[PDB]
From a paper:
Here we describe efficient routes starting from validated parallel and antiparallel peptide assemblies to design two families of α-helical barrel proteins with central channels that bind small molecules. Computational designs are seeded by the sequences and structures of defined de novo oligomeric barrel-forming peptides, and adjacent helices are connected by loop building. For targets with antiparallel helices, short loops are sufficient. However, targets with parallel helices require longer connectors; namely, an outer layer of helix–turn–helix–turn–helix motifs that are packed onto the barrels.
Using the experimental apCC-Hex structure as a seed, we designed short loop sequences computationally to connect adjacent helices to generate an up-down α-meander structure. The sequences and structures were named sc-apCC-6-LLIA and sc-apCC-6-SLLA, respectively, for single-chain antiparallel coiled-coil proteins with six central helices. As the peptide assemblies were hyperthermally stable, we heat treated the cell lysate (75 °C for 10 min) and subjected the soluble fraction to immobilized metal affinity chromatography (IMAC) and size exclusion chromatography (SEC) to yield highly pure proteins in a minimal number of steps. Circular dichroism spectroscopy showed that all five proteins were α-helical and hyperthermally stable structures, and AUC confirmed that they were monomers. Moreover, DPH binding suggested that they had accessible hydrophobic channels. The outlier is sc-apCC-6-SLLA, in which the experimental structure and model differ at one of the Ser–Ser (g–g) helical interfaces. Such polar contacts are notoriously difficult to model. In more detail, for the antiparallel α-helical barrel proteins, sc-apCC-6-SLLA returned partial matches within proteins containing four-helix bundles. Thus, the success rate for making these single-chain constructs from the seven antiparallel designs test was five soluble proteins (71%) and two new α-helical barrel crystal structures (29%).
Numbering used by the authors: -3 to 65, 69 to 176, 178 to 212
The structure:
Amino acid sequence: SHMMGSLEELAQSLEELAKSLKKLAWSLKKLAQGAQPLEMSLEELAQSLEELAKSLKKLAWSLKKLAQTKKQGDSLEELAQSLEELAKSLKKLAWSLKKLAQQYGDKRTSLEELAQSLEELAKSLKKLAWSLKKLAQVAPTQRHRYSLEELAQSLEELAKSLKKLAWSLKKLAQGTNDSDLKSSLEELAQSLEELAKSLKKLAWSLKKLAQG
């Protein structure tokens, strides 16, 4: 009911985020056309973003299968695997971002902090996957309400971390002036903010389910 709707809203927000990442990848490739140094690092960062976008669309499909359906346990484990794969792609993205930042001056610090934030996000997603694999081994009617409330809290903390990431990308955009890079960064920030909202709505559905 409300759970299926919250899971599908989240999958939709993940697919929109993937599209914003693909736009940013294109901006970075155009930046790599020779009008500024560090062509190779820009191209590598662009490729990592396209790989991140592919992992997000795989995660969205996993959520859609969960929303549509005794097979609940299997679907949760598939979801946890997709999260672990997304975490790996985030760590690779952070690695490429650090390499790019080595080429900048005043901007190097904000780019390095951004990469550190992605590394912390990856760690939080691995912990979420672990919690989901635990839940998957408990029959849905035997799950403790506190197990559901802890999951909702974890999603609310993830939303806060994405809003902080969005704020840092907005500040980066203000300092930029690319081609359409500024517009691609602002759009990405808005997609992360929408994702954070969809995570808060899912947390609400879990807290509602915990009360039942």
